[PDB]
Amino acid sequence: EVQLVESGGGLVKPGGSLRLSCSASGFDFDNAWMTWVRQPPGKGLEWVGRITGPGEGWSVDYAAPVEGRFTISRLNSINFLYLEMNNLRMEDSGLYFCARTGKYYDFWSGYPPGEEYFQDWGRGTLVTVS
Amino acid sequence: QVQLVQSGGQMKKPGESMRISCRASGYEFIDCTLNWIRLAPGKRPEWMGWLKPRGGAVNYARPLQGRVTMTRDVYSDTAFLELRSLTVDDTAVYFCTRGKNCDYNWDFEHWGRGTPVIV
Amino acid sequence: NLWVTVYYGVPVWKDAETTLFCASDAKEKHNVWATHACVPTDPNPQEIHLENVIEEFNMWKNNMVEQMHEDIISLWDQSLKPCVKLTPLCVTLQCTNVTNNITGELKNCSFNMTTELRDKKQKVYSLFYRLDVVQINNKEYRLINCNTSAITQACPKVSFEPIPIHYCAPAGFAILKCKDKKFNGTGPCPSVSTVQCTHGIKPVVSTQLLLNGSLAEEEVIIRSENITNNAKNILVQLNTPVQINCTRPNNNTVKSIRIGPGQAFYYTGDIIGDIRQAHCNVSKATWNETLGKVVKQLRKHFGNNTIIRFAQSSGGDLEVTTHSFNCGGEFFYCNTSGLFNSTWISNSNDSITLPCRIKQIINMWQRIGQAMYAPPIQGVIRCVSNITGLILTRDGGSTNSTTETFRPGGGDMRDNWRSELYKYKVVKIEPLGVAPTRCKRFLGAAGSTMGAASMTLGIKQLQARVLAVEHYLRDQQLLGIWGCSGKLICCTNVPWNSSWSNRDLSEIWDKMTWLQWDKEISNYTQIIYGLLEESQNQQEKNEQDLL
Amino acid sequence: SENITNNAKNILVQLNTPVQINCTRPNNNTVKSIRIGPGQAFYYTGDII
Amino acid sequence: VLTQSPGTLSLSPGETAIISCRTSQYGSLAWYQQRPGQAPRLVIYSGSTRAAGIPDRFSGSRWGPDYNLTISNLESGDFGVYYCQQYEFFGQGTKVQV
Numbered sequence: 001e002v003q004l005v006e007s008g009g010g011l012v013k014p015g016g017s018l019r020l021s022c023s024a025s026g027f028d029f030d031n032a033w034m035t036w037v038r039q040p041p042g043k044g045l046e047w048v049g050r051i052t053g054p055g056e057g058w059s060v061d062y063a064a065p066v067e068g069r070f071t072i073s074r075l076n077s078i079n080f081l082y083l084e085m086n087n088l089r090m091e092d093s094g095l096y097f098c099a100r101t102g103k104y105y106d107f108w109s110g111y112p113p114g115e116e117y118f119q120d121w122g123r124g125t126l127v128t129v130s
Numbered sequence: 131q132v133q134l135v136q137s138g139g140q141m142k143k144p145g146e147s148m149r150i151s152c153r154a155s156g157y158e159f160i161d162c163t164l165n166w167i168r169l170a171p172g173k174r175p176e177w178m179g180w181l182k183p184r185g186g187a188v189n190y191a192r193p194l195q196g197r198v199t200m201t202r203d204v205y206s207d208t209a210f211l212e213l214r215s216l217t218v219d220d221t222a223v224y225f226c227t228r229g230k231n232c233d234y235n236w237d238f239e240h241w242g243r244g245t246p247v248i249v
Numbered sequence: 250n251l252w253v254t255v256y257y258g259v260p261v262w263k264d265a266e267t268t269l270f271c272a273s274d275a276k277e278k279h280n281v282w283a284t285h286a287c288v289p290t291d292p293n294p295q296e297i298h299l300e301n302v303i304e305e306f307n308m309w310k311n312n313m314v315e316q317m318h319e320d321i322i323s324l325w326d327q328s329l330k331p332c333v334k335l336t337p338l339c340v341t342l343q344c345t346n347v348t349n350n351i352t353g354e355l356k357n358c359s360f361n362m363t364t365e366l367r368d369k370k371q372k373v374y375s376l377f378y379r380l381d382v383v384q385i386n387n388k389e390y391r392l393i394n395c396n397t398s399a400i401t402q403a404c405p406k407v408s409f410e411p412i413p414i415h416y417c418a419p420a421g422f423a424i425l426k427c428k429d430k431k432f433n434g435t436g437p438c439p440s441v442s443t444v445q446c447t448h449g450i451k452p453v454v455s456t457q458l459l460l461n462g463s464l465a466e467e468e469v470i471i472r473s474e475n476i477t478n479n480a481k482n483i484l485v486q487l488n489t490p491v492q493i494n495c496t497r498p499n500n501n502t503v504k505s506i507r508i509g510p511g512q513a514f515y516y517t518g519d520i521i522g523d524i525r526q527a528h529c530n531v532s533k534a535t536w537n538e539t540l541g542k543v544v545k546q547l548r549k550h551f552g553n554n555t556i557i558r559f560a561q562s563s564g565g566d567l568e569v570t571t572h573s574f575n576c577g578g579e580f581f582y583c584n585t586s587g588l589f590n591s592t593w594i595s596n597s598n599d600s601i602t603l604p605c606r607i608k609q610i611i612n613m614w615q616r617i618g619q620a621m622y623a624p625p626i627q628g629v630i631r632c633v634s635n636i637t638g639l640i641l642t643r644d645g646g647s648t649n650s651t652t653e654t655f656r657p658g659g660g661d662m663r664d665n666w667r668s669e670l671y672k673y674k675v676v677k678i679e680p681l682g683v684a685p686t687r688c689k690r691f692l693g694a695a696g697s698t699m700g701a702a703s704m705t706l707g708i709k710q711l712q713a714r715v716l717a718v719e720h721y722l723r724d725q726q727l728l729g730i731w732g733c734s735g736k737l738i739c740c741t742n743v744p745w746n747s748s749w750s751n752r753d754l755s756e757i758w759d760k761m762t763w764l765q766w767d768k769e770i771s772n773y774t775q776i777i778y779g780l781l782e783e784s785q786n787q788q789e790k791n792e793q794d795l796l
Numbered sequence: 797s798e799n800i801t802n803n804a805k806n807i808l809v810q811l812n813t814p815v816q817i818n819c820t821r822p823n824n825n826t827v828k829s830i831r832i833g834p835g836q837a838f839y840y841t842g843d844i845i
Numbered sequence: 846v847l848t849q850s851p852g853t854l855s856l857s858p859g860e861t862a863i864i865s866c867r868t869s870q871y872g873s874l875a876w877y878q879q880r881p882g883q884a885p886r887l888v889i890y891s892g893s894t895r896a897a898g899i900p901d902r903f904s905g906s907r908w909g910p911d912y913n914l915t916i917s918n919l920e921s922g923d924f925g926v927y928y929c930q931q932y933e934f935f936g937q938g939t940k941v942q943v
């Protein structure tokens with residue numbers, strides 16, 4: 001039972017900034033690395049970014065529209081995944097999801113970096129810009 | 131030590147006027163409110179008014195407005211009550227009272243000896 | 250599982266009483282209300298609006314008002330200290346009426362007075378108001394405050410004009426202010442902000458009607474510690490001003506004589522024109538509309554079928570029964586029986602003229618054995634001011650009357666400044682906190698839950714700065730003994746006991762603010778301070794670092 | 797005491813058992829108050845009853 | 846606004862006396878005792894708290910607007926006249942006799 005209660009964000013002008021938090025309890029936050037994704041309301045899920053494993057670089061990789069816009073951080077001491085989203089545009093909206101990324105690879109069909117999967121997600125947190 | 135030394139005891143006829151006094155002691159007279167209470171046998175105890183020194187502000191009970199006056203001497207620390215026109219109904223013992231903790235006036239911990247007035 | 254972690258800079262504040270320093274704007278250093286020692290003010294005060302947070306205010310019990318009252322009295326006495334003593338003025342005055350030359354407020358009051366040399370006396374003709382002069386026992390009088398107290402002359406150049414005075418808290422303290430427009434003095438305030446200095450508060454002295462000051466924003470606001478209590482004064486704040494002009498028609502020429510080495514007694518020489526009478530004007534329609542608004546608000550606290558009756562003050566000395574104020578250096582006392590004369594049943598361009606008397610012997614903040622002589626001001630005086638508040642008192646004492654009578658009442662002078670400091674509450678800052686965490690070695694975001702806040706994050710002035718320094722070192726001293734020489738965050742080696750209110754760490758850092766957490770572990774705090782003491786650091790630093 | 801044998805040096809004696817001493821002024825003084833100036837008042841023994 | 850239990854209550858020494866005062870308005874309620882030929886005393890204040898110097902026998906309160914004063918084990922110094930104050934009001938006044 002990996003509860004992922006993500007709670008943050010709300011109404012904001014087209015230009016602005018805000019600060020979403022994604023709690024997590026019931027697994028090993030200390031090395032397993034996590035991802036954010038965005039699902040605008042009239043749209044499906046779209047990938048945002050993901051912290052890398054502590055010891056696996058501890059870096060972040062943004063997405064094609066989001067690069068230069070968002071920033072991801074983790075305070076593993078308190079099991080919290082923060083996402084700062086700044087310099088906002090109007091398409092930025094939806095039930096922003098935080099999930100626990102995984103590492104998957106195998107030989108035979110091996111190819112770097114392989115693939116990852118989003119097993120345990122959160123419930124959701126609505127953010128809408130105006 | 132808080133002591134309200136009350137003084138009076140004068141027999142009066144109807145239609146005349148009366149005055150009684152209440153000297154404060156122990157506590158600083160200036161920074162604490164005084165009240166005047168009347169007790170008649172077989173009747174409700176009626177609160178007659180209150181007097182705040184440091185300005186001498188007065189609040190008279192509505193039934194007695196126009197007939198009761200309360201003043202004070204700051205230097206002798208003495209409050210004075212006066213009634214302009216007594217009647218038979220004014221037969222009662224009058225008390226000069228102080229709140230237990232003036233912050234809240236309506237706890238009459240300290241009472242005077244009592245001044246009977248017969249009409 | 251969980252370990253005590255020491256966070257410094259947590260946004261947790263606790264109420265408190267402290268010292269506060271004046272901070273004026275620019276300053277002729279002749280203002281009675283200027284100490285010529287108040288630090289310059291901030292041109293851009295750092296007013297920080299908070300996130301969602303409710304703060305329980307109580308304007309009736311804060312120490313800002315008591316401290317301001319003490320400061321005002323001390324400042325006035327300081328101003329009056331280096332001025333003439335008027336000891337030899339208490340003499341037998343032989344007074345005659347100021348007549349029409351053919352046909353009793355003013356009195357001539359000739360008298361003998363001392364001069365530069367003690368071997369000589371001079372005969373001086375003056376003019377004193379009837380209020381200042383009391384008859385002895387052959388038309389012989391004296392000044393009213395001679396058989397008690399001693400009258401001190403105000404220095405002629407000292408001006409009594411109110412000046413804005415900001416009150417600033419020392420470092421380590423802050424001043425929360427409630428911005429809720431309908432706030433009525435007590436209870437929760439959802440809209441809280443923080444400042445270092447209050448806005449400029451004019452020390453305006455008035456008794457029945459509060460002048461100038463600050464107005465309500467939306468509607469007339471009624472404040473009382475208990476509206477049903479007959480002893481607590483009701484403070485009314487107006488959302489619009491009612492202009493109150495006032496004048497002293499008399500063309501009054503002042504003359505001065507020397508009464509001793511380096512001392513001069515200023516007194517009214519004479520009057521050129523007709524004597525006339527001092528008076529004030531209040532717009533009739535505006536005052537009637539204001540009373541209508543006050544009745545509309547008062548009907549909410551009481552029954553909606555109650556007849557609200559306004560009457561004159563029922564008694565007291567001249568400061569309470571009459572609207573007492575300062576104008577151009579003179580002291581007016583106006584009847585105001587024409588303003589509160591009405592009954593209001595539960596469903597143009599005329600001016601109400603209030604007679605006013607002038608008193609030179611003044612006793613403000615009524616004290617046993619002290620008084621002032623306000624010297625007369627030459628020429629005609631006019632003022633223009635805003636009535637922005639009232640002080641009312643209920644009569645009570647009847648159950649079947651069905652009508653509530655509201656009379657003006659001066660009450661206490663502190664009631665003036667309660668109408669100005671109702672917004673503010675002083676809070677001590679306690680930046681230190683402890684929390685459970687899985688590591689073993691400004692006031693913004695107070696309303697934001699923990700975790701998000703973690704990454705998001707004259708003589709009075711001297712005592713004030715010194716205290717802060719001590720407090721600063723105190724925190725550092727704690728950080729010294731906890732093996733945390735750094736700042737902000739440090740992990741420590743004391744495990745979290747389950748008995749210390751445990752939510753399992755998923756909720757405390759998501760759902761709960763720093764203030765709530767402090768409330769949760771306040772009673773237990775000295776225990777963790779005990780365990781985080783150098784008892785742990787003796788095991789960690791003395792036993793293990795002697796190679 | 798400081799050096800004991802030294803004169804010119806007070807010897808402080810502290811008792812284990814207190815000795816009760818009681819004083820009185822048996823005069824029923826009637827005290828009057830008179831004003832000597834503005835505010836200032838002088839208190840003197842008026843009479844002896 | 847204020848009413849009380851019967852004013853001719855008569856008990857011997859030793860029993861428990863129940864004095865009921867009903868109040869219409871909100872406010873702190875105090876209980877006063879008047880001895881014969883002496884000024885009243887504050888017996889209870891703020892509804893339930895005893896005044897200084899009052900024994901523990903005088904106690905009692907009620908959440909609702911019907912306050913009850915309980916006087917257990919009456920002595921000779923009791924058996925005065927009891928009043929119930931709420932702000933200015935005092936009520937009818939009930940005597941306790943033998």
Ligand SMILES: *[C@@H]1O[C@H](CO)[C@@H](O[C@@H]2O[C@H](CO)[C@@H](O[C@@H]3O[C@H](CO)[C@@H](O)[C@H](O[C@H]4O[C@H](CO)[C@@H](O)[C@H](O)[C@@H]4O)[C@@H]3O)[C@H](O)[C@H]2NC(C)=O)[C@H](O)[C@H]1NC(C)=O
Nearest residue numbers: 408409410411453460461574575576577578632633634635
């Ligand atoms: C509420 O605020 C109002 C508005 O500020 C305030 O009215 C103002 O009062 C002051 C003080 O009386 C007035 O300033 C005076 O105005 C005239 C201008 O001709 C001068 O006579 C005065 O200067 C003389 O006095 C000074 C000492 O105070 C001396 O230094 C000087 O040399 C002169 O002898 C003085 O400047 C001001 O004009 C009014 N404002 C208006 C708009 O009329 C009012 O007093 C405040 N309320 C209360 C209760 O005080």
Ligand SMILES: *[C@@H]1O[C@H](CO)[C@@H](O[C@@H]2O[C@H](CO)[C@@H](O[C@@H]3O[C@H](CO)[C@@H](O)[C@H](O)[C@@H]3O)[C@H](O)[C@H]2NC(C)=O)[C@H](O)[C@H]1NC(C)=O
Nearest residue numbers: 435473474475476477478550870871872873874908909910
């Ligand atoms: C005037 O003074 C009173 C007492 O000092 C202030 O508080 C009031 O106190 C009474 C109890 O004495 C409260 O009664 C409460 O009522 C409800 C009943 O459902 C319930 O919540 C409680 O159990 C309790 O019995 C009363 O509510 C309380 N008044 C308020 C407004 O909270 C009173 O507030 C003062 N009046 C004012 C400010 O207008």
Ligand SMILES: *[C@@H]1O[C@H](CO)[C@@H](O)[C@H](O)[C@H]1NC(C)=O
Nearest residue numbers: 344345346347348353354388
């Ligand atoms: C002053 O006027 C009063 C009131 O009319 C009068 O009684 C008094 O005698 C007058 N004084 C003198 C000295 O004429």
Ligand SMILES: *[C@@H]1O[C@H](CO)[C@@H](O)[C@H](O)[C@H]1NC(C)=O
Nearest residue numbers: 347348357374375376519520
């Ligand atoms: C006061 O008396 C003197 C006596 O010389 C006189 O000159 C002066 O005019 C009088 N004042 C008034 C206002 O009448």
Ligand SMILES: *[C@@H]1O[C@H](CO)[C@@H](O)[C@H](O)[C@H]1NC(C)=O
Nearest residue numbers: 341342343359360361370372
């Ligand atoms: C002033 O003193 C002189 C001394 O001769 C005396 O005659 C006169 O009456 C005194 N005047 C007053 C007004 O007291």
Ligand SMILES: *[C@@H]1O[C@H](CO)[C@@H](O)[C@H](O)[C@H]1NC(C)=O
Nearest residue numbers: 203205206383384385396397
């Ligand atoms: C003397 O002072 C007292 C107060 O100490 C005051 O009541 C009295 O009125 C004064 N005397 C006269 C004659 O006014």
Ligand SMILES: *[C@@H]1O[C@H](CO)[C@@H](O)[C@H](O)[C@H]1NC(C)=O
Nearest residue numbers: 431432433434435436437438
């Ligand atoms: C006014 O005071 C009452 C208690 O008397 C309180 O419940 C109320 O919240 C206050 N009004 C506001 C707007 O806070």
Ligand SMILES: *[C@@H]1O[C@H](CO)[C@@H](O)[C@H](O)[C@H]1NC(C)=O
Nearest residue numbers: 492493494530531532600633
């Ligand atoms: C006060 O006087 C000004 C002119 O100085 C005038 O415009 C205003 O109407 C007056 N106020 C009242 C209430 O009459």
Ligand SMILES: *[C@@H]1O[C@H](CO)[C@@H](O)[C@H](O)[C@H]1NC(C)=O
Nearest residue numbers: 533534536537538540541591
């Ligand atoms: C004030 O207005 C009320 C209605 O609000 C009216 O009945 C009353 O006559 C007015 N009073 C004056 C003095 O104009």
Ligand SMILES: *[C@@H]1O[C@H](CO)[C@@H](O)[C@H](O)[C@H]1NC(C)=O
Nearest residue numbers: 561567570571583584585586
């Ligand atoms: C105000 O005028 C009324 C008119 O009846 C009068 O009774 C009252 O005494 C006056 N106030 C003062 C303080 O003289």
Ligand SMILES: *[C@@H]1O[C@H](CO)[C@@H](O)[C@H](O)[C@H]1NC(C)=O
Nearest residue numbers: 500501521522627628629630
């Ligand atoms: C007072 O009267 C004198 C007479 O010379 C005149 O010069 C002066 O202007 C008057 N003052 C005022 C303020 O009208």
Ligand SMILES: *[C@@H]1O[C@H](CO)[C@@H](O)[C@H](O)[C@H]1NC(C)=O
Nearest residue numbers: 461464489490491633634635
């Ligand atoms: C009265 O209030 C108005 C509105 O706030 C303001 O513009 C005006 O300056 C005030 N009057 C004075 C004399 O301060």
Ligand SMILES: *[C@@H]1O[C@H](CO)[C@@H](O)[C@H](O)[C@H]1NC(C)=O
Nearest residue numbers: 797798799800801802805807
């Ligand atoms: C105090 O008494 C001791 C013995 O108890 C003695 O040796 C010492 O000299 C005395 N102190 C003096 C004389 O100051």
